[PDB]
Design a protein around this ligand. Structure first.
Ligand SMILES: O=C(/C=C/c1ccc(O)cc1)c1ccc(O)cc1O
Ligand code: NA
Ligand code: NA
Length: 130
């Protein structure tokens, strides 16, 4: 079974022509302010693209994580006006952080990074437009 090597699943979709979409002030804020400041963080790098289980040598990642999400996927979704409301985008951020905590253990370097971005994310969404 040497040909059976670890592979990544297809990444989450960033467009869907049959999904209803909207452009709200809150969604514009989520891209302009929330994502674009998190994106510039020193700890942002592990979350700027889907977990590449092949490259990072984590063949068990997608055996554990069944609803993957990352800021690269969120950024593309926000830029593509993929979302209907802010809650949908916020749920994607929540999913990204929770996956990191599920897959890893408290105190891991990746977890300490996720906790730091999560606290900044909650700070930034504390006040949304309207
Ligand atoms: O970068 C890593 C993991 C990132 C990550 C991102 C999101 C998650 O939900 C879980 C892990 C990583 C993991 C193991 C390793 O040896 C070297 C590495 O660089
Ligand atoms: Na865990
Ligand atoms: Na705010």
């Amino acid at each position: 079974h040497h040909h059976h090597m670890s592979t990544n699943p297809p990444p989450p979709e960033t467009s869907n022509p049959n999904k209803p979409k909207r452009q709200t002030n809150q969604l514009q804020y989520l891209l302009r302010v929330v994502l674009k400041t998190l994106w510039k963080h020193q700890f942002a790098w592990p979350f700027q693209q889907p977990v590449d289980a092949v490259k990072l040598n984590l063949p068990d990642y997608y055996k554990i994580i069944k609803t993957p999400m990352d800021m690269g996927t969120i950024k593309k979704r926000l830029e593509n006006n993929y979302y209907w409301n802010a809650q949908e985008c916020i749920q994607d951020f929540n999913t990204m952080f929770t996956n990191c905590y599920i897959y890893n253990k408290p105190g891991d370097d990746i977890v300490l990074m996720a906790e730091a971005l999560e606290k900044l994310f909650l700070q930034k969404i504390n006040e949304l437009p309207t």
